[PDB]
Ligand binder design. Structure first.
Ligand SMILES: Nc1ncnc2c1ncn2[C@@H]1O[C@H](COP(=O)(O)O)[C@@H](OP(=O)(O)O)[C@H]1O
Ligand SMILES: Nc1ncnc2c1ncn2[C@@H]1O[C@H](COP(=O)(O)O)[C@@H](OP(=O)(O)O)[C@H]1O
Lengths: 282, 285
Protein backbone atom coordinates (compact mmCIF):
# COMPACT_ATOMS: atom_id res chain seq x y z
CA UNK A 1 0.00 0.00 0.00
CA UNK A 2 1.90 3.05 -1.36
CA UNK A 3 0.82 6.62 -0.61
CA UNK A 4 1.69 9.54 -2.87
CA UNK A 5 1.37 13.26 -2.30
CA UNK A 6 2.65 16.76 -3.00
CA UNK A 7 5.29 16.47 -0.25
CA UNK A 8 6.81 13.06 -1.00
CA UNK A 9 10.51 12.48 -1.78
CA UNK A 10 10.87 12.59 -5.55
CA UNK A 11 13.79 12.30 -7.89
CA UNK A 12 14.13 14.09 -11.16
CA UNK A 13 16.92 13.04 -13.44
CA UNK A 14 17.81 15.12 -16.49
CA UNK A 15 20.20 17.17 -18.63
CA UNK A 16 20.75 17.43 -22.38
CA UNK A 17 19.89 14.22 -24.24
CA UNK A 18 22.70 11.75 -24.87
CA UNK A 19 24.00 12.67 -21.39
CA UNK A 20 23.68 9.13 -20.08
CA UNK A 21 20.42 10.14 -18.44
CA UNK A 22 18.79 6.76 -19.31
CA UNK A 23 21.86 5.17 -17.76
CA UNK A 24 21.47 7.34 -14.67
CA UNK A 25 17.84 6.50 -14.07
CA UNK A 26 18.20 2.81 -14.96
CA UNK A 27 20.53 2.30 -11.98
CA UNK A 28 17.98 3.97 -9.74
CA UNK A 29 15.09 1.76 -11.05
CA UNK A 30 17.13 -1.32 -10.15
CA UNK A 31 17.12 -0.10 -6.53
CA UNK A 32 14.17 -1.87 -4.89
CA UNK A 33 12.96 1.24 -3.05
CA UNK A 34 13.04 3.21 -6.30
CA UNK A 35 11.40 3.46 -9.69
CA UNK A 36 11.94 6.04 -12.46
CA UNK A 37 10.63 4.18 -15.48
CA UNK A 38 10.83 5.55 -19.01
CA UNK A 39 10.65 9.08 -20.44
CA UNK A 40 7.11 10.45 -20.18
CA UNK A 41 7.27 13.05 -23.01
CA UNK A 42 4.19 14.56 -21.50
CA UNK A 43 5.63 16.15 -18.40
CA UNK A 44 8.01 18.46 -20.28
CA UNK A 45 5.25 19.17 -22.76
CA UNK A 46 2.83 20.37 -20.07
CA UNK A 47 5.60 22.39 -18.45
CA UNK A 48 6.49 24.04 -21.79
CA UNK A 49 2.89 25.29 -22.02
CA UNK A 50 2.96 26.04 -18.25
CA UNK A 51 5.88 28.33 -18.81
CA UNK A 52 4.01 29.92 -21.73
CA UNK A 53 0.88 31.16 -19.85
CA UNK A 54 2.85 33.02 -17.18
CA UNK A 55 -9.31 37.89 -13.98
CA UNK A 56 -10.56 34.33 -14.63
CA UNK A 57 -9.64 33.43 -11.01
CA UNK A 58 -6.90 31.30 -12.62
CA UNK A 59 -4.11 32.58 -10.31
CA UNK A 60 -0.56 31.19 -10.02
CA UNK A 61 -1.71 29.13 -6.98
CA UNK A 62 -4.33 27.28 -9.05
CA UNK A 63 -2.15 26.53 -12.10
CA UNK A 64 0.51 25.18 -9.77
CA UNK A 65 -2.03 23.16 -7.77
CA UNK A 66 -3.21 21.79 -11.11
CA UNK A 67 0.36 21.10 -12.22
CA UNK A 68 1.22 19.23 -8.99
CA UNK A 69 -1.72 16.92 -9.32
CA UNK A 70 -1.15 16.45 -13.06
CA UNK A 71 2.48 15.48 -12.75
CA UNK A 72 2.00 13.38 -9.57
CA UNK A 73 -0.50 11.14 -11.34
CA UNK A 74 1.66 10.59 -14.41
CA UNK A 75 4.75 9.50 -12.45
CA UNK A 76 2.69 7.53 -9.92
CA UNK A 77 0.71 5.71 -12.58
CA UNK A 78 2.94 5.39 -15.63
CA UNK A 79 5.02 2.63 -14.00
CA UNK A 80 5.24 -0.01 -11.23
CA UNK A 81 4.85 1.39 -7.69
CA UNK A 82 7.62 2.00 -5.13
CA UNK A 83 8.38 3.88 -1.88
CA UNK A 84 10.61 6.48 -3.65
CA UNK A 85 9.41 7.74 -7.00
CA UNK A 86 11.54 9.20 -9.70
CA UNK A 87 11.12 10.58 -13.22
CA UNK A 88 13.46 10.96 -16.16
CA UNK A 89 12.69 13.42 -18.94
CA UNK A 90 15.76 15.29 -20.14
CA UNK A 91 14.29 18.78 -20.51
CA UNK A 92 12.50 18.87 -17.15
CA UNK A 93 15.66 20.12 -15.52
CA UNK A 94 14.88 23.28 -17.48
CA UNK A 95 12.09 24.13 -15.08
CA UNK A 96 13.66 22.69 -11.96
CA UNK A 97 13.43 25.94 -9.93
CA UNK A 98 9.68 25.79 -10.49
CA UNK A 99 9.61 22.02 -9.88
CA UNK A 100 11.26 22.57 -6.49
CA UNK A 101 8.58 25.01 -5.44
CA UNK A 102 5.84 22.52 -6.37
CA UNK A 103 7.41 19.53 -4.62
CA UNK A 104 9.48 21.00 -1.74
CA UNK A 105 11.02 17.58 -1.02
CA UNK A 106 11.97 16.58 -4.53
CA UNK A 107 15.65 16.32 -5.45
CA UNK A 108 17.45 16.77 -8.73
CA UNK A 109 20.28 15.12 -10.55
CA UNK A 110 21.67 17.02 -13.51
CA UNK A 111 23.59 14.81 -15.97
CA UNK A 112 26.68 16.59 -17.25
CA UNK A 113 28.42 14.97 -20.22
CA UNK A 114 31.14 16.36 -22.50
CA UNK A 115 28.85 18.03 -25.07
CA UNK A 116 31.36 16.85 -27.65
CA UNK A 117 30.27 13.37 -26.76
CA UNK A 118 26.60 14.44 -26.55
CA UNK A 119 26.62 16.26 -29.87
CA UNK A 120 28.57 13.53 -31.62
CA UNK A 121 26.13 10.98 -30.22
CA UNK A 122 23.06 12.84 -31.46
CA UNK A 123 24.67 13.57 -34.83
CA UNK A 124 25.79 10.04 -35.62
CA UNK A 125 22.70 8.42 -34.09
CA UNK A 126 20.21 10.76 -35.89
CA UNK A 127 18.42 11.77 -32.66
CA UNK A 128 16.19 14.74 -33.61
CA UNK A 129 15.64 17.15 -30.66
CA UNK A 130 13.95 20.55 -29.96
CA UNK A 131 15.76 22.86 -32.44
CA UNK A 132 18.96 20.80 -32.72
CA UNK A 133 19.80 20.87 -36.44
CA UNK A 134 21.71 17.64 -37.18
CA UNK A 135 23.51 19.11 -40.23
CA UNK A 136 26.04 21.29 -38.36
CA UNK A 137 28.17 20.41 -35.35
CA UNK A 138 28.52 24.20 -34.87
CA UNK A 139 24.78 24.52 -34.55
CA UNK A 140 24.42 21.55 -32.21
CA UNK A 141 27.17 22.67 -29.89
CA UNK A 142 25.95 26.23 -29.63
CA UNK A 143 22.60 24.70 -28.86
CA UNK A 144 23.91 22.20 -26.31
CA UNK A 145 25.73 25.19 -24.92
CA UNK A 146 22.70 27.41 -24.50
CA UNK A 147 20.76 24.43 -23.19
CA UNK A 148 23.21 23.28 -20.53
CA UNK A 149 23.94 26.83 -19.34
CA UNK A 150 20.32 27.25 -18.32
CA UNK A 151 19.70 23.94 -16.54
CA UNK A 152 22.91 24.59 -14.57
CA UNK A 153 21.87 28.15 -13.72
CA UNK A 154 18.65 26.60 -12.44
CA UNK A 155 20.48 23.85 -10.57
CA UNK A 156 22.70 26.51 -8.96
CA UNK A 157 19.83 28.76 -7.98
CA UNK A 158 18.17 25.62 -6.66
CA UNK A 159 21.04 24.91 -4.31
CA UNK A 160 23.63 22.26 -3.47
CA UNK A 161 21.06 20.78 -1.10
CA UNK A 162 18.46 19.90 -3.73
CA UNK A 163 20.48 19.66 -6.95
CA UNK A 164 23.49 17.49 -7.61
CA UNK A 165 25.54 17.67 -10.80
CA UNK A 166 26.45 14.26 -12.14
CA UNK A 167 29.40 13.77 -14.45
CA UNK A 168 28.71 10.96 -16.90
CA UNK A 169 32.38 10.18 -17.35
CA UNK A 170 32.97 10.26 -13.58
CA UNK A 171 30.10 7.81 -13.38
CA UNK A 172 31.31 5.47 -16.17
CA UNK A 173 34.80 5.28 -14.66
CA UNK A 174 33.95 5.18 -10.92
CA UNK A 175 30.38 3.91 -10.70
CA UNK A 176 30.84 2.57 -7.16
CA UNK A 177 32.15 5.83 -5.70
CA UNK A 178 29.61 7.78 -7.77
CA UNK A 179 26.38 6.12 -6.78
CA UNK A 180 27.41 6.10 -3.14
CA UNK A 181 27.57 9.90 -2.99
CA UNK A 182 24.49 10.20 -5.21
CA UNK A 183 22.20 8.23 -3.00
CA UNK A 184 23.89 9.99 -0.06
CA UNK A 185 22.94 13.35 -1.44
CA UNK A 186 19.60 11.66 -2.06
CA UNK A 187 19.50 10.31 1.50
CA UNK A 188 18.64 6.65 0.69
CA UNK A 189 20.27 3.51 2.18
CA UNK A 190 22.89 1.69 0.11
CA UNK A 191 22.12 -1.07 -2.38
CA UNK A 192 24.74 -2.78 -4.55
CA UNK A 193 22.07 -3.63 -7.18
CA UNK A 194 22.85 -0.23 -8.66
CA UNK A 195 25.98 -1.61 -10.24
CA UNK A 196 24.04 -4.59 -11.56
CA UNK A 197 21.27 -2.75 -13.31
CA UNK A 198 21.87 -4.91 -16.42
CA UNK A 199 20.56 -7.83 -14.40
CA UNK A 200 17.20 -6.16 -13.53
CA UNK A 201 15.61 -5.25 -16.92
CA UNK A 202 11.95 -6.22 -17.42
CA UNK A 203 12.12 -7.57 -13.90
CA UNK A 204 9.80 -6.28 -11.13
CA UNK A 205 10.98 -3.63 -8.59
CA UNK A 206 13.69 -2.99 -11.14
CA UNK A 207 14.17 -1.42 -14.53
CA UNK A 208 11.46 -0.81 -17.13
CA UNK A 209 12.69 0.00 -20.70
CA UNK A 210 11.02 1.62 -23.72
CA UNK A 211 11.89 -0.44 -26.80
CA UNK A 212 11.72 2.66 -28.99
CA UNK A 213 13.65 5.03 -26.73
CA UNK A 214 17.05 5.78 -28.26
CA UNK A 215 19.39 5.14 -25.34
CA UNK A 216 18.25 1.61 -24.86
CA UNK A 217 20.47 -0.88 -26.70
CA UNK A 218 23.40 0.68 -24.77
CA UNK A 219 21.77 0.62 -21.27
CA UNK A 220 21.08 -3.13 -21.75
CA UNK A 221 24.81 -3.67 -21.12
CA UNK A 222 26.39 -2.84 -17.73
CA UNK A 223 28.27 0.40 -17.06
CA UNK A 224 30.81 0.31 -19.91
CA UNK A 225 33.53 2.64 -21.11
CA UNK A 226 33.24 2.35 -24.90
CA UNK A 227 31.35 5.63 -25.26
CA UNK A 228 33.53 8.06 -23.26
CA UNK A 229 35.80 9.18 -26.07
CA UNK A 230 34.74 7.63 -29.40
CA UNK A 231 33.83 11.23 -30.36
CA UNK A 232 37.41 12.48 -30.65
CA UNK A 233 38.69 12.70 -34.22
CA UNK A 234 35.21 13.26 -35.71
CA UNK A 235 34.89 17.01 -35.05
CA UNK A 236 35.25 19.40 -38.03
CA UNK A 237 38.66 21.08 -37.69
CA UNK A 238 37.17 24.59 -37.76
CA UNK A 239 34.87 23.60 -34.92
CA UNK A 240 37.82 22.12 -32.98
CA UNK A 241 39.27 25.54 -33.66
CA UNK A 242 36.37 27.74 -32.51
CA UNK A 243 35.79 25.33 -29.67
CA UNK A 244 35.88 27.81 -26.73
CA UNK A 245 33.74 30.47 -28.52
CA UNK A 246 31.03 27.97 -29.49
CA UNK A 247 31.08 26.37 -26.02
CA UNK A 248 32.39 28.56 -23.15
CA UNK A 249 30.41 26.24 -20.86
CA UNK A 250 32.87 23.42 -21.56
CA UNK A 251 35.48 25.44 -19.68
CA UNK A 252 33.20 26.48 -16.80
CA UNK A 253 32.16 22.90 -16.20
CA UNK A 254 35.87 21.99 -16.20
CA UNK A 255 35.85 20.52 -19.72
CA UNK A 256 39.04 21.74 -21.42
CA UNK A 257 37.59 22.83 -24.80
CA UNK A 258 41.01 22.43 -26.47
CA UNK A 259 41.82 19.04 -24.97
CA UNK A 260 41.03 16.57 -27.72
CA UNK A 261 39.90 14.64 -25.68
CA UNK A 262 40.77 15.71 -22.12
CA UNK A 263 42.05 13.08 -19.74
CA UNK A 264 38.84 12.09 -17.96
CA UNK A 265 40.51 9.68 -15.51
CA UNK A 266 41.37 6.03 -14.89
CA UNK A 267 38.86 3.10 -14.87
CA UNK A 268 37.92 0.90 -11.86
CA UNK A 269 38.64 -2.82 -12.33
CA UNK A 270 34.88 -3.32 -12.14
CA UNK A 271 34.21 -1.26 -15.27
CA UNK A 272 37.09 -2.63 -17.29
CA UNK A 273 35.91 -6.16 -16.58
CA UNK A 274 32.40 -5.14 -17.54
CA UNK A 275 33.63 -3.62 -20.81
CA UNK A 276 35.52 -6.78 -21.55
CA UNK A 277 32.35 -8.77 -20.93
CA UNK A 278 30.68 -6.45 -23.42
CA UNK A 279 33.17 -7.18 -26.19
CA UNK A 280 32.75 -10.91 -25.59
CA UNK A 281 28.98 -10.67 -26.28
CA UNK A 282 27.38 -11.26 -22.85
CA UNK B 1 -15.78 22.07 5.01
CA UNK B 2 -16.32 21.14 1.35
CA UNK B 3 -14.80 17.99 -0.06
CA UNK B 4 -14.15 17.16 -3.68
CA UNK B 5 -13.28 14.18 -5.88
CA UNK B 6 -13.50 12.50 -9.29
CA UNK B 7 -17.08 11.38 -8.78
CA UNK B 8 -18.77 14.43 -7.31
CA UNK B 9 -21.74 16.07 -9.11
CA UNK B 10 -20.39 18.56 -11.61
CA UNK B 11 -22.19 20.95 -13.90
CA UNK B 12 -20.74 21.63 -17.27
CA UNK B 13 -22.13 24.60 -19.09
CA UNK B 14 -21.18 25.14 -22.70
CA UNK B 15 -22.20 25.76 -26.32
CA UNK B 16 -21.30 28.18 -29.13
CA UNK B 17 -20.42 31.62 -27.55
CA UNK B 18 -22.98 34.42 -27.78
CA UNK B 19 -25.59 31.76 -26.87
CA UNK B 20 -26.37 33.13 -23.37
CA UNK B 21 -24.00 30.74 -21.60
CA UNK B 22 -23.09 33.62 -19.20
CA UNK B 23 -26.72 34.12 -18.38
CA UNK B 24 -27.15 30.37 -17.87
CA UNK B 25 -24.24 30.15 -15.50
CA UNK B 26 -24.91 33.53 -13.86
CA UNK B 27 -28.29 32.24 -12.74
CA UNK B 28 -26.66 29.02 -11.53
CA UNK B 29 -24.07 30.84 -9.39
CA UNK B 30 -26.87 32.76 -7.71
CA UNK B 31 -28.04 29.48 -6.16
CA UNK B 32 -26.57 29.28 -2.62
CA UNK B 33 -25.64 25.59 -3.15
CA UNK B 34 -23.94 26.23 -6.54
CA UNK B 35 -20.82 27.94 -7.99
CA UNK B 36 -19.74 28.04 -11.66
CA UNK B 37 -17.52 31.13 -11.68
CA UNK B 38 -15.75 32.65 -14.68
CA UNK B 39 -14.41 31.04 -17.85
CA UNK B 40 -11.09 29.47 -16.86
CA UNK B 41 -9.69 29.39 -20.42
CA UNK B 42 -7.16 26.74 -19.45
CA UNK B 43 -9.30 23.61 -19.16
CA UNK B 44 -10.43 23.50 -22.75
CA UNK B 45 -6.84 24.41 -23.59
CA UNK B 46 -5.33 21.33 -21.97
CA UNK B 47 -8.10 19.11 -23.32
CA UNK B 48 -7.35 20.11 -26.87
CA UNK B 49 -3.74 19.07 -26.30
CA UNK B 50 -4.67 15.86 -24.62
CA UNK B 51 -6.93 15.31 -27.63
CA UNK B 52 -4.03 15.95 -29.97
CA UNK B 53 -1.76 13.49 -28.24
CA UNK B 54 -4.30 10.72 -28.57
CA UNK B 55 -5.35 12.16 -31.92
CA UNK B 56 -1.76 11.38 -32.93
CA UNK B 57 -0.72 8.05 -34.47
CA UNK B 58 3.01 8.01 -33.63
CA UNK B 59 3.02 9.74 -30.21
CA UNK B 60 0.39 7.36 -28.78
CA UNK B 61 2.53 4.36 -29.69
CA UNK B 62 5.29 6.25 -27.98
CA UNK B 63 3.26 7.33 -24.95
CA UNK B 64 1.77 3.89 -24.16
CA UNK B 65 5.22 2.28 -24.26
CA UNK B 66 6.39 4.74 -21.61
CA UNK B 67 3.64 3.39 -19.40
CA UNK B 68 1.72 6.61 -20.07
CA UNK B 69 -1.65 5.13 -21.10
CA UNK B 70 -5.12 6.57 -21.52
CA UNK B 71 -5.91 5.73 -17.90
CA UNK B 72 -2.95 7.71 -16.56
CA UNK B 73 -3.67 10.58 -18.93
CA UNK B 74 -7.22 10.53 -17.84
CA UNK B 75 -6.12 10.21 -14.23
CA UNK B 76 -3.98 13.28 -14.70
CA UNK B 77 -6.66 15.12 -16.61
CA UNK B 78 -9.04 14.55 -13.74
CA UNK B 79 -6.66 15.63 -11.00
CA UNK B 80 -5.78 18.64 -13.09
CA UNK B 81 -9.24 19.81 -14.12
CA UNK B 82 -10.50 19.15 -10.63
CA UNK B 83 -8.07 21.44 -8.91
CA UNK B 84 -8.84 24.32 -11.23
CA UNK B 85 -12.55 23.92 -10.70
CA UNK B 86 -12.10 23.49 -6.96
CA UNK B 87 -9.84 26.45 -6.44
CA UNK B 88 -10.63 29.15 -9.00
CA UNK B 89 -13.71 30.50 -7.17
CA UNK B 90 -15.65 30.36 -3.90
CA UNK B 91 -16.26 26.93 -2.36
CA UNK B 92 -19.69 25.40 -3.07
CA UNK B 93 -21.61 22.15 -2.46
CA UNK B 94 -22.19 21.67 -6.18
CA UNK B 95 -19.48 22.90 -8.45
CA UNK B 96 -19.98 24.01 -12.00
CA UNK B 97 -17.84 25.42 -14.80
CA UNK B 98 -18.45 27.47 -17.92
CA UNK B 99 -16.08 27.44 -20.92
CA UNK B 100 -17.97 27.40 -24.26
CA UNK B 101 -16.01 24.75 -26.21
CA UNK B 102 -15.77 22.34 -23.25
CA UNK B 103 -18.98 20.77 -24.55
CA UNK B 104 -17.04 19.65 -27.66
CA UNK B 105 -15.57 16.83 -25.55
CA UNK B 106 -18.46 15.97 -23.17
CA UNK B 107 -18.25 12.30 -24.26
CA UNK B 108 -14.79 12.23 -22.77
CA UNK B 109 -15.73 14.58 -19.89
CA UNK B 110 -18.51 12.27 -18.78
CA UNK B 111 -16.05 9.38 -18.79
CA UNK B 112 -13.85 11.48 -16.52
CA UNK B 113 -16.60 12.57 -14.15
CA UNK B 114 -19.19 9.81 -13.94
CA UNK B 115 -21.65 12.04 -12.08
CA UNK B 116 -21.16 15.23 -14.03
CA UNK B 117 -24.06 16.84 -15.84
CA UNK B 118 -24.07 18.89 -19.05
CA UNK B 119 -26.20 21.87 -20.21
CA UNK B 120 -25.96 22.54 -23.97
CA UNK B 121 -27.11 26.16 -24.56
CA UNK B 122 -28.91 26.33 -27.93
CA UNK B 123 -29.47 29.81 -29.43
CA UNK B 124 -30.60 30.37 -33.01
CA UNK B 125 -27.34 30.82 -34.95
CA UNK B 126 -28.55 33.97 -36.70
CA UNK B 127 -28.65 35.79 -33.28
CA UNK B 128 -25.26 34.43 -32.16
CA UNK B 129 -23.45 35.07 -35.54
CA UNK B 130 -24.84 38.59 -35.50
CA UNK B 131 -23.97 39.07 -31.83
CA UNK B 132 -20.41 37.85 -32.54
CA UNK B 133 -20.04 39.91 -35.76
CA UNK B 134 -21.36 43.19 -34.29
CA UNK B 135 -19.67 43.01 -30.86
CA UNK B 136 -13.08 32.83 -31.43
CA UNK B 137 -10.76 29.92 -32.42
CA UNK B 138 -12.13 28.72 -35.78
CA UNK B 139 -14.31 31.71 -36.86
CA UNK B 140 -13.86 34.51 -39.59
CA UNK B 141 -14.30 38.30 -38.89
CA UNK B 142 -15.64 39.51 -42.31
CA UNK B 143 -18.32 37.03 -43.53
CA UNK B 144 -21.83 36.13 -42.31
CA UNK B 145 -21.71 33.16 -44.69
CA UNK B 146 -18.49 31.92 -43.00
CA UNK B 147 -19.68 32.67 -39.40
CA UNK B 148 -22.84 30.61 -39.82
CA UNK B 149 -21.34 27.59 -41.67
CA UNK B 150 -18.92 27.57 -38.71
CA UNK B 151 -21.58 28.03 -36.03
CA UNK B 152 -23.18 25.15 -37.94
CA UNK B 153 -20.26 22.73 -37.91
CA UNK B 154 -19.59 23.61 -34.21
CA UNK B 155 -23.15 23.13 -32.93
CA UNK B 156 -23.49 19.97 -35.10
CA UNK B 157 -20.67 18.35 -33.07
CA UNK B 158 -21.70 19.41 -29.52
CA UNK B 159 -25.20 18.04 -30.13
CA UNK B 160 -24.06 14.62 -31.46
CA UNK B 161 -21.88 14.55 -28.35
CA UNK B 162 -24.83 15.59 -26.15
CA UNK B 163 -26.88 12.89 -27.93
CA UNK B 164 -24.46 10.01 -27.55
CA UNK B 165 -24.04 11.24 -23.95
CA UNK B 166 -27.71 10.52 -23.21
CA UNK B 167 -30.76 12.57 -22.25
CA UNK B 168 -29.96 11.64 -18.67
CA UNK B 169 -26.55 13.30 -18.64
CA UNK B 170 -27.07 15.97 -21.29
CA UNK B 171 -29.87 18.55 -21.57
CA UNK B 172 -30.29 20.96 -24.53
CA UNK B 173 -31.29 24.35 -23.02
CA UNK B 174 -33.05 26.76 -25.43
CA UNK B 175 -31.99 30.40 -24.99
CA UNK B 176 -35.23 31.85 -26.27
CA UNK B 177 -37.23 29.46 -24.08
CA UNK B 178 -35.08 30.37 -21.07
CA UNK B 179 -35.32 34.12 -21.62
CA UNK B 180 -39.08 33.87 -22.41
CA UNK B 181 -39.90 31.39 -19.65
CA UNK B 182 -37.24 31.76 -16.91
CA UNK B 183 -39.27 30.10 -14.12
CA UNK B 184 -40.31 27.18 -16.40
CA UNK B 185 -36.80 26.48 -17.77
CA UNK B 186 -35.09 26.73 -14.33
CA UNK B 187 -37.65 24.40 -12.83
CA UNK B 188 -36.96 21.82 -15.60
CA UNK B 189 -33.20 22.29 -15.22
CA UNK B 190 -32.80 21.97 -11.38
CA UNK B 191 -35.04 18.94 -11.83
CA UNK B 192 -32.78 17.30 -14.46
CA UNK B 193 -29.85 18.25 -12.24
CA UNK B 194 -31.66 16.96 -9.17
CA UNK B 195 -30.98 20.23 -7.38
CA UNK B 196 -33.48 21.68 -4.91
CA UNK B 197 -35.27 24.78 -6.15
CA UNK B 198 -34.24 28.10 -4.65
CA UNK B 199 -35.84 31.42 -5.48
CA UNK B 200 -32.47 33.22 -5.76
CA UNK B 201 -32.26 31.75 -9.32
CA UNK B 202 -34.64 34.30 -10.91
CA UNK B 203 -33.05 37.20 -8.99
CA UNK B 204 -29.47 36.77 -10.29
CA UNK B 205 -28.94 40.49 -10.94
CA UNK B 206 -29.11 41.18 -7.18
CA UNK B 207 -26.27 38.74 -6.32
CA UNK B 208 -23.25 39.83 -8.50
CA UNK B 209 -20.05 40.10 -6.43
CA UNK B 210 -22.08 38.84 -3.43
CA UNK B 211 -20.93 35.73 -1.39
CA UNK B 212 -22.43 32.31 -2.39
CA UNK B 213 -23.59 33.89 -5.67
CA UNK B 214 -22.37 35.38 -8.99
CA UNK B 215 -18.67 36.09 -9.55
CA UNK B 216 -17.82 37.91 -12.81
CA UNK B 217 -14.74 38.92 -14.85
CA UNK B 218 -14.73 42.64 -15.81
CA UNK B 219 -13.12 41.80 -19.22
CA UNK B 220 -15.45 38.96 -20.42
CA UNK B 221 -17.57 40.02 -23.44
CA UNK B 222 -25.69 39.64 -17.78
CA UNK B 223 -25.59 42.50 -15.20
CA UNK B 224 -29.33 43.08 -15.93
CA UNK B 225 -32.17 40.61 -15.05
CA UNK B 226 -33.76 38.29 -17.67
CA UNK B 227 -34.60 40.83 -20.52
CA UNK B 228 -36.27 40.34 -23.98
CA UNK B 229 -33.95 42.72 -25.88
CA UNK B 230 -31.44 40.33 -27.49
CA UNK B 231 -34.07 37.89 -28.95
CA UNK B 232 -34.92 39.07 -32.50
CA UNK B 233 -32.59 42.08 -32.96
CA UNK B 234 -30.58 40.04 -35.50
CA UNK B 235 -33.38 40.08 -38.12
CA UNK B 236 -32.98 42.61 -40.95
CA UNK B 237 -29.21 42.83 -40.73
CA UNK B 238 -28.58 39.60 -42.67
CA UNK B 239 -27.20 39.98 -46.23
CA UNK B 240 -30.19 38.96 -48.42
CA UNK B 241 -28.03 36.32 -50.19
CA UNK B 242 -27.18 34.56 -46.89
CA UNK B 243 -30.93 34.76 -46.03
CA UNK B 244 -31.56 33.08 -49.42
CA UNK B 245 -29.07 30.23 -48.99
CA UNK B 246 -30.06 29.82 -45.30
CA UNK B 247 -31.01 26.13 -45.36
CA UNK B 248 -27.75 24.99 -47.02
CA UNK B 249 -25.43 27.13 -44.80
CA UNK B 250 -27.10 25.82 -41.63
CA UNK B 251 -29.23 22.61 -42.04
CA UNK B 252 -28.82 22.47 -38.23
CA UNK B 253 -31.25 25.30 -37.49
CA UNK B 254 -33.94 23.07 -39.13
CA UNK B 255 -33.25 19.89 -37.09
CA UNK B 256 -32.75 21.94 -33.85
CA UNK B 257 -36.28 23.24 -34.40
CA UNK B 258 -35.32 26.56 -35.98
CA UNK B 259 -37.12 27.53 -39.20
CA UNK B 260 -34.32 28.68 -41.63
CA UNK B 261 -37.02 30.42 -43.68
CA UNK B 262 -38.90 32.16 -40.86
CA UNK B 263 -37.29 35.62 -40.44
CA UNK B 264 -37.58 35.37 -37.48
CA UNK B 265 -39.39 32.20 -36.44
CA UNK B 266 -42.07 32.98 -33.83
CA UNK B 267 -40.21 32.04 -30.67
CA UNK B 268 -43.17 32.39 -28.26
CA UNK B 269 -44.77 34.74 -25.70
CA UNK B 270 -43.05 36.35 -22.66
CA UNK B 271 -43.89 35.77 -19.00
CA UNK B 272 -45.31 38.89 -17.30
CA UNK B 273 -42.13 38.45 -15.18
CA UNK B 274 -39.73 38.90 -18.19
CA UNK B 275 -41.69 41.92 -19.58
CA UNK B 276 -41.55 43.79 -16.19
CA UNK B 277 -37.85 42.92 -16.22
CA UNK B 278 -37.47 44.35 -19.79
CA UNK B 279 -39.30 47.48 -18.49
CA UNK B 280 -37.07 48.14 -15.36
CA UNK B 281 -33.97 47.82 -17.64
CA UNK B 282 -35.29 50.40 -20.21
CA UNK B 283 -35.99 52.66 -17.15
CA UNK B 284 -32.39 52.35 -15.85
CA UNK B 285 -32.51 50.01 -12.82
N1 LIG C 1 25.53 0.90 -19.60
C1 LIG C 1 26.06 2.02 -20.16
N2 LIG C 1 27.37 2.41 -20.03
C2 LIG C 1 27.89 3.54 -20.60
N3 LIG C 1 27.12 4.36 -21.33
C3 LIG C 1 25.80 4.10 -21.53
C4 LIG C 1 25.19 2.89 -20.94
N4 LIG C 1 23.90 2.86 -21.28
C5 LIG C 1 23.68 3.96 -22.05
N5 LIG C 1 24.81 4.69 -22.19
C6 LIG C 1 24.94 5.96 -22.93
O1 LIG C 1 23.74 6.72 -22.90
C7 LIG C 1 24.10 7.77 -23.79
C8 LIG C 1 22.87 8.53 -24.22
O2 LIG C 1 22.42 9.22 -23.07
P1 LIG C 1 20.86 9.42 -22.84
O3 LIG C 1 20.75 8.23 -21.89
O4 LIG C 1 20.73 10.79 -22.20
O5 LIG C 1 20.20 9.39 -24.22
C9 LIG C 1 24.77 7.07 -24.96
O6 LIG C 1 25.89 7.83 -25.38
P2 LIG C 1 26.59 7.41 -26.77
O7 LIG C 1 25.41 7.53 -27.72
O8 LIG C 1 27.73 8.38 -27.02
O9 LIG C 1 27.15 6.00 -26.55
C10 LIG C 1 25.17 5.72 -24.39
O10 LIG C 1 26.55 5.40 -24.58
N1 LIG D 1 -29.99 39.46 -18.39
C1 LIG D 1 -29.99 39.01 -19.67
N2 LIG D 1 -31.15 38.86 -20.37
C2 LIG D 1 -31.16 38.41 -21.64
N3 LIG D 1 -30.04 38.09 -22.32
C3 LIG D 1 -28.79 38.18 -21.74
C4 LIG D 1 -28.69 38.66 -20.34
N4 LIG D 1 -27.37 38.67 -20.01
C5 LIG D 1 -26.67 38.23 -21.10
N5 LIG D 1 -27.51 37.92 -22.13
C6 LIG D 1 -27.12 37.44 -23.52
O1 LIG D 1 -26.08 36.44 -23.62
C7 LIG D 1 -25.42 36.62 -24.90
C8 LIG D 1 -23.95 36.33 -24.65
O2 LIG D 1 -23.98 35.10 -23.94
P1 LIG D 1 -22.71 34.10 -23.97
O3 LIG D 1 -22.24 34.17 -22.53
O4 LIG D 1 -23.32 32.77 -24.38
O5 LIG D 1 -21.70 34.70 -24.95
C9 LIG D 1 -25.71 38.03 -25.45
O6 LIG D 1 -26.24 38.04 -26.80
P2 LIG D 1 -26.24 39.35 -27.82
O7 LIG D 1 -24.76 39.58 -28.11
O8 LIG D 1 -27.11 39.05 -29.06
O9 LIG D 1 -26.88 40.45 -26.98
C10 LIG D 1 -26.67 38.62 -24.40
O10 LIG D 1 -27.80 39.30 -24.97
Amino acid sequence: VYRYGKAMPLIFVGGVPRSGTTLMRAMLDAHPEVRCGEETRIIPRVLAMRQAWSEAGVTDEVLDAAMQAFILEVIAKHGEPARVLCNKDPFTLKSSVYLSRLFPNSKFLLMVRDGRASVHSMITRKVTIAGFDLSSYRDCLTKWNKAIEVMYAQCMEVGKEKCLPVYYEQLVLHPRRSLKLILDFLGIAWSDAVLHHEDLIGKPGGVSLSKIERSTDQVIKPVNLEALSKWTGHIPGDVVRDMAQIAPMLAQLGYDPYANPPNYGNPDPFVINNTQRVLKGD
